[PDB]
Amino acid sequence: AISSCPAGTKLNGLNYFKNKADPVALPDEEYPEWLWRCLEVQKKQRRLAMKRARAQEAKILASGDLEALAPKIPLQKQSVNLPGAVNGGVQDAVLADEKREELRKAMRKERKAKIKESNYLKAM
Amino acid sequence: SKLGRTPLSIPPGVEITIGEPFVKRDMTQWKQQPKRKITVQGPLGQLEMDIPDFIKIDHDAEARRATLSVANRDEKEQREMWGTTWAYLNRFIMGVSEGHTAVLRLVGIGYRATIDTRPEKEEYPGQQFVCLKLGFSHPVEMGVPKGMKASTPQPTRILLEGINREQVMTFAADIRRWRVPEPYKGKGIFVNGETIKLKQK
Amino acid sequence: MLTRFITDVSTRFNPFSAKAKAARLFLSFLPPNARSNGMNITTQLLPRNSTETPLLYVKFKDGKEMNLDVENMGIKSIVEEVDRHSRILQKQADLNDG
């Protein structure tokens, strides 16, 4: 009941073969779980926020400590050793091999801005 | 220099003979700087040059090698001649053993070349004269300098040979000076793979 | 390095041998399409326990067959000898073509 398309829905224009019928939506449970999570990447008036937004953040923030206000260095500049241990186990191994992939994206995103800006500085 | 440090592999047959610091008195100069006469003899011939004294040659006869070094790397004059003296020895070693060659290509309808002897204008007995038809009213004839062997496998192809690279490439430029490659039809004399970019029309 | 004039190359060496380092580098310099063009290449890997002297075989398209020891000469030195012979063929090709 979480998906808009119910079971039995006719998927229009998804069959280009002659001897076959257009796909029919199957039950929601039968579909893999990642399909309900792969969509996690989709992202006067100023005066009103100034009255409330500016003030509320200062109160909750509790600017009395310098721990939650640090620069918060990104993952592409730290030097802490990655969570890799010898003979730690498959769980440790997989869990250790998963951060090497989360760091890969970090360097990738940096190349985009570094290349987009290098091409922007040549087409002034 | 990163080239002066590289040892010079002396192939079999080549012999390097280092002289001694000498000074040829010059009445026009109050103090001449000592030099060293370096001879490089081998199968094809013998070449000689005079290097400054501050350059030191560690001629290793055992391993057949010779590394160069200067007395002071901080002086601009010594850094330059260090690499230039190395580049010359490299050519000398690889010129007396193997030899240097230059290829000239004659592009253009009516361009020919022959190697004949002109006893009238011979500077030395048996001088070979390259005769070139390049569209001029007169015939263009040039005598090969003493020490070069010029031949034409084909009418539109010259082949120069010699042990002195500077002499070979200099004589190929004199022949090319008559017809420099043009960018509209590619006509001219191209030396050692030289090419010219053509125009649209 | 010019590989166009190289017909086939047969290299036999042991990986764990520090001397075979130069042999491995020579294999990488070859371009990707060397197999499609028709060049034959056979690579033999010797056991780690006992290592036979490394062997390098080269042959140009004019019949010349080159054989250079891997231990005495380094990768840089080997590239010079193969370049000289492959270079003269370029001049000869241009000389006799046209």
Added chain:
Amino acid sequence: VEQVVKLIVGAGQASPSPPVGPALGSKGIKSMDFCKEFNARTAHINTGTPMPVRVTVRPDRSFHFDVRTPHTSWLLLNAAEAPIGKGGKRKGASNPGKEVVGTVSLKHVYEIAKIKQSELRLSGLPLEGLCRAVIYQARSIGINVIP
């Protein structure tokens, strides 16, 4: 060098024509032979369906072409139920940033990816990472993605 050419042709419509004729007729290969050889490749698809082809022309004018699945954009619009415009083909948003043509659900994305995984050259890529590649293209054609 074996040059390659890109041409979009109909399902069973292979004959000398603007899409087919000039694309390969000039190079030298026998267009008629290729035209009659393409029909055998596409004999189970609806007539007129667009089919990308990468024809490789080896030296000696011996051609070999690999038929490819329909364009992802053509499938997204075909499955988005977009209004037909100029040329009789479903057109996409002129300004994907503001305009919106259709609302394709994720269940349609899960199928558009399965039909694109049939290709051997694309059969290795994981399906989890392939459904987000088309979702990344729906933002460029003005189609909204619905959970």
Added chain:
Amino acid sequence: RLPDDYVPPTQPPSARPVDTRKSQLLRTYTSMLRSTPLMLIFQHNNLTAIEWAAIRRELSLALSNVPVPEGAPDITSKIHLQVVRTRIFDVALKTVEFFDPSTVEPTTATTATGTKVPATYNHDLSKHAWKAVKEATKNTEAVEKTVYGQLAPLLVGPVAILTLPSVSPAHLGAALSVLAPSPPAFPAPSRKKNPGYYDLTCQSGLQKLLLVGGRIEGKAFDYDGIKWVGGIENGIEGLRAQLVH
């Protein structure tokens, strides 16, 4: 405000710049040499993009036909054929072998508040690691006796490394026949079942990959030795046979 002596907690003093990819990649291999018990070292020769994709397409397919019905972790996707930086990967072995993280003395550290807190620098990118590996490498002969010395000649030129999270002989036969087939021990897949394997692109890529050597549990292994490990059906079964005796 943050004081001058304060240093970020997730950015201790490094031996060399951390922003550069040279060092950021060193932190990866060092942890990969610890989390990967079984590792095969290949040599790639100017493989093209399409060829690489095809080669990695057979592994996924061949590795997806391994029976694992024991409810074990889904070890079928963390196996990757990764091209590595041989120069920076050769330093990883040094830092992983000739460096004892337990030989560092903790020192006070200043936080945003300025309070001194004791901290120890054991990260691989530390100046202490750089100093140890250098001094340890001074002895040439003693290094050859170490595992690094038995794998230093292998890290020459371009090398591609295959990483397996666990020592599964079954996964080896699925990956050892697609990259270095040698029948009848590890025969290549059949054409009547795996036609993609014998493709123009794939077949032309597998000829440029050579299995030079392998590393298992921090032990150098020769190509012939890898067959023995791959020959075993399973590790747990091999131990049972000894118990019967």
Added chain:
Amino acid sequence: MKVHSAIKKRCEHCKVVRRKANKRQNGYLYIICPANPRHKQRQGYR
């Protein structure tokens, strides 16, 4: 050739060299370019 008082490189192949300098004259600064001959420039007057 264009004789300017402010010579600048107009591509990656342009090179700055001081030529014609000898025992009798100081020479000039040139912008030599083998790719495009229109990038040729000189600084100074005879």
Added chain:
RNA sequence: UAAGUCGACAAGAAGAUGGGCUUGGAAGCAGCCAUAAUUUAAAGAUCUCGUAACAGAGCACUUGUUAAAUCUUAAAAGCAU
């Protein structure tokens, strides 16, 4: 900056995909809008060429070889051209 700086050389520089619109045609590269992804040693819905439009050649970027033990790059200042 020996974790190989700098330069050169060898190769790579992918895929969904000719992004959508525009146009006789617009396929990275007339113009307009978008430019969260993905997989990779890396690869901009594209920085300079090139085509009528494709193709093609380079660049950013990636690995390897060579190779520096005071020797990389930029800025400012002084005196000169």
